[PDB]
Structure 1
Amino acid sequence: SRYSPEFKDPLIDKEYYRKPVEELTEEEKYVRELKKTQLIKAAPAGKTSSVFEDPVISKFTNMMMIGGNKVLARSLMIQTLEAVKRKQFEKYHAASAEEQATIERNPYTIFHQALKNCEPMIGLVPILKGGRFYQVPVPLPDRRRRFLAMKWMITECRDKKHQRTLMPEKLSHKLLEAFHNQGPVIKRKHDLHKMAEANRALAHYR
């Protein structure tokens, strides 16, 4: 690393600094004073003080990226968001008066909720002890399941049975299915929670 150990990662939060000195506790006051002496790394290309910044969508874009092509990854992500928004508007205009109160048209809400509906609570760990591999259950950290939701979504949308359907249209359809607790990714979550229930005795091995 070209940064020395002294350098600390920057805090881009714009509302943090505007917090009044009166609201500062003694501990937070000490942290603020300490940070002044410290060296800070240059903020990286990416996150910004922009009010539209969404770390989850940035991570999803980074995980769709291939070969450093971030322009194409972001183009695909924005096309997916636009397709989701247009499909929801189309479904909203064709709805009855009472059905229009339960149709979500905000694409960010749909994306976050879809990625929440695919997170597995428990997982499996391959562990060979007796000369035979044993898949023991384990509860996943929050980071691990948050990563797994995105990885499963991307892998499902890259499956080759989806033939000549361009990526944005596939991804919007998968997101809208997962929004309603349907589709192959929710099935992949359920079939993991079932293979981790059919091995609840091997947990003791861990």
Structure 2
Amino acid sequence: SRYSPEFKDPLIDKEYYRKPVEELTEEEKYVRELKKTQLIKAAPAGKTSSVFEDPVISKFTNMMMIGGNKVLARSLMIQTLEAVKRKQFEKYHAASAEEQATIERNPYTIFHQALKNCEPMIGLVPIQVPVPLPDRRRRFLAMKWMITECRDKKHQRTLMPEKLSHKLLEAFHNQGPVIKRKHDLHKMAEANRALAHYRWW
């Protein structure tokens, strides 16, 4: 890394800086004073202060990226979000007044809830042994499972936006091959339950 170890990662959060001094604790005051003497890495070209920045969606776009085609990855992500929103609006209009209360229409909420539903609780590690999964690994496994399922060859000629929107809605409703894969992981963990003692941590 061209950055010397002294450089510190940038904190991009307007609220953190607009916070009044009075609300700050002594530890927080000391941290703010110290940061005035430290070097700060240049803000990456990916994340900004836009209120429409969703780190989960940014990470999903990065994962979907192929060969540094960030433009195409972003295009696919926005197309998927638009397709999800349009399907939700169509269902909302086609639905009765009662079901319109239930029918969600926010693509960001749909995406977050779908990935959360696809997050696996217990993993398997060679030691195979059932084991707890850290939160970062859970999120990455959810995202990778979603992307791999969308990239599966079983879908013929269907475009990635449509495929991913359909899979995302299925996951949001707790259905689809992604949830099936999570259930399969859980079932294998249950089957190897007896081997849980092999784990030394």
How high is the TM-score relative to the length of structure 1?
A: 0.96
User: For 2:151 and 2:65, how far apart are their aligned partners in 1?
Assistant: 12
Q: Does 1:66 align with 2:66?
A: yes
Please state how far the C-alpha of 1:126 moved relative to its aligned partner: 1.8
Please state how far the C-alpha of 1:148 moved relative to its aligned partner: 0.3
User: For 1:200 and 1:99, how far apart are their aligned partners in 2?
Assistant: 41
Per-residue CA deviation, residues 63-119 of structure 1 (Å, 9 max, x unaligned), is 000000000000000000000000000000011111100000000000000000000
How high is the TM-score relative to the length of structure 2?
A: 0.98
Please state how far the C-alpha of 1:121 moved relative to its aligned partner: 0.7
User: For 1:44 and 1:125, how far apart are their aligned partners in 2?
Assistant: 34
User: For 2:101 and 2:151, how far apart are their aligned partners in 1?
Assistant: 34
Please state how far the C-alpha of 1:136 moved relative to its aligned partner: 0.4
User: For 1:99 and 1:68, how far apart are their aligned partners in 2?
Assistant: 42
Q: Which residue of 2 aligns with 1:151?
A: 144
Please state how far the C-alpha of 1:157 moved relative to its aligned partner: 0.3
User: For 2:52 and 2:18, how far apart are their aligned partners in 1?
Assistant: 19
Please state how far the C-alpha of 1:193 moved relative to its aligned partner: 0.7
User: For 1:2 and 1:99, how far apart are their aligned partners in 2?
Assistant: 56
How many matched pairs? 199
User: For 2:198 and 2:159, how far apart are their aligned partners in 1?
Assistant: 46
Please state how far the C-alpha of 1:199 moved relative to its aligned partner: 1.0
User: For 1:3 and 1:98, how far apart are their aligned partners in 2?
Assistant: 57
Q: Which has the higher helix share?
A: 2
Gaps of 5+ in 1: 128-134
Please state how far the C-alpha of 1:3 moved relative to its aligned partner: 0.4
Please state how far the C-alpha of 1:200 moved relative to its aligned partner: 1.2
User: For 1:5 and 1:60, how far apart are their aligned partners in 2?
Assistant: 29
Q: Which residue of 1 aligns with 2:36?
A: 36
User: For 2:83 and 2:187, how far apart are their aligned partners in 1?
Assistant: 33
User: For 1:161 and 1:44, how far apart are their aligned partners in 2?
Assistant: 37
Gaps of 5+ in 2: none
User: For 1:15 and 1:195, how far apart are their aligned partners in 2?
Assistant: 45
Please state how far the C-alpha of 1:155 moved relative to its aligned partner: 0.2
Give the SS at the match of 1:138: strand
User: For 1:194 and 1:160, how far apart are their aligned partners in 2?
Assistant: 25
Give the SS at the match of 2:193: coil
Please state how far the C-alpha of 1:167 moved relative to its aligned partner: 0.4
* Runs (4+) off by over 4 Å: none
Please state how far the C-alpha of 1:169 moved relative to its aligned partner: 0.2
Give the SS at the match of 1:170: helix
User: For 1:61 and 1:158, how far apart are their aligned partners in 2?
Assistant: 14
Per-residue CA deviation, residues 1-22 of structure 1 (Å, 9 max, x unaligned), is 1000110000011110000000
Please state how far the C-alpha of 1:203 moved relative to its aligned partner: 1.1
Give the SS at the match of 2:76: helix
Please state how far the C-alpha of 1:161 moved relative to its aligned partner: 0.8
Q: Quote the sequence identity (%).
A: 100
